[PDB]
């Protein structure tokens, strides 16, 4: 659809030329080239709100999206028309596939997540800290399509997982574990952030020991 390509270039001319240039070649020391990135990269980077960036630092953090769903498709098509690349999965209606990307085998997805994903993030996908300034964000707000596109495209410091290294069935199973583990309630009470011993010790010192000491002063005497 020529209207979609023209609309996407019309958004690009006013939003992305500052760091990527008019012909998507990339401005040196300001932004890389968008040739060959594909629609999947643009879709993820805009739906997550990551782009357009505002300054140069360790990582551009996530923020509310700057464009609506219709504008993301136009922006992705324009970049896709220049150099090609991976495309976001779609359902029968032509919209972005959300429910159909959920795998039916979560047990395989959990092992795959632990082997390939739980290194930068944690087991429950809460996030982690990278080398210097950089950090892996929380996975509790990403829809399955965003996770799929992140695996396809490999954001700033994330090894790209090709359709050959990770088949779509494996990718569908991986997001199934990510989506499930986000909305499963904790079984032993409050989850305490799902980080491990670090919140457990802090909660201990501030609750159990505060109550134990406070009770002791009630029972005991001063001076």
């Amino acid at each position: 659809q020529s209207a979609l390509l023209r609309t996407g270039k019309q958004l690009f001319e006013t939003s992305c030329v500052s760091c990527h240039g008019a012909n998507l070649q990339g401005v040196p020391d300001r932004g890389p080239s968008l040739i060959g990135t594909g629609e999947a990269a643009v879709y993820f980077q805009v739906s997550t709100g990551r782009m357009p960036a505002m300054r140069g630092e360790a990582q551009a953090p996530s923020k509310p999206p700057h464009f609506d769903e219709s504008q993301i498709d136009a922006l992705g098509a324009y970049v896709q028309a220049n150099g090609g690349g991976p495309t976001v999965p779609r359902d029968d209606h032509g919209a972005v596939a959300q429910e159909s990307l959920i795998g039916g085998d979560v047990a395989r997805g959990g092992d795959l997540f632990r082997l390939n994903c739980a290194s930068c993030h944690n087991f429950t996908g809460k996030g982690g800290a990278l080398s210097s300034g950089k950090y892996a964000p929380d996975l509790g707000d990403a829809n399955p399509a965003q996770i799929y596109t992140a695996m396809l495209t490999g954001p700033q410091n994330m090894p790209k997982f090709s359709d050959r290294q990770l088949t779509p069935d494996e990718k569908r199973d991986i997001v199934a574990y990510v989506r499930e583990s986000a909305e499963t309630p904790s079984y032993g009470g409050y989850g305490l952030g799902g980080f491990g011993p670090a919140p457990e010790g802090m909660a201990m010192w501030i609750i159990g020991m505060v109550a134990a000491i406070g009770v002791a002063m009630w029972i005991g005497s001063r001076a």
Partner: protein
């Protein structure tokens, strides 16, 4: 500190399978070779396709692409290789593209994962890109099932 002159988001390169090259005034983006493989080497005589995008940094004049040579075989250019003033010159049709093409006739075996030198000249530059072999949106090739051992 991380927002100084040396940033980690400004030095970041493209997350694709291409090579960024500067031929004086024309920028080469996503320079890669498309070559389906079945055996460890692509035998000589197999026709492959070289794909890239040429961007003209200058917005005053035009440029034309001529004499693409490499030590892998003979490279044939078909179509209008003239890049506009402030436009692009897309050669080949990469996967996910709903007509200038580069045809390469191999004389020596090639394989995925190695780098092969290519020479790009338009009118005022002779630069080497070391073009690799990149696979597009093709699915993973089936692997024969191993026996009991």
């Amino acid at each position: 500190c991380s927002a100084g002159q040396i940033s980690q988001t400004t030095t970041q390169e493209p997350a694709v399978n291409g090579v960024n090259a500067q031929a004086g005034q024309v920028s080469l983006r996503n320079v890669h070779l498309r070559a389906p493989q079945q055996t460890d080497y692509v035998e000589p005589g197999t026709t492959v396709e070289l794909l890239f995008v040429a961007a003209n940094d200058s917005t005053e004049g035009s440029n034309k692409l001529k004499s693409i040579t490499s030590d892998v075989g003979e490279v044939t250019l078909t179509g209008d290789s003239t890049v506009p003033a402030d436009g692009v010159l897309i050669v080949g049709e990469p996967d996910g593209q709903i007509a200038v093409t580069a045809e390469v006739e191999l004389t020596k075996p090639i394989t995925n994962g190695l780098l092969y030198d290519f020479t790009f000249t338009f009118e005022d530059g002779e630069t080497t890109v070391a073009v690799p072999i990149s696979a597009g949106e093709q699915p993973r090739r089936p692997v024969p099932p191993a026996g009991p051992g």
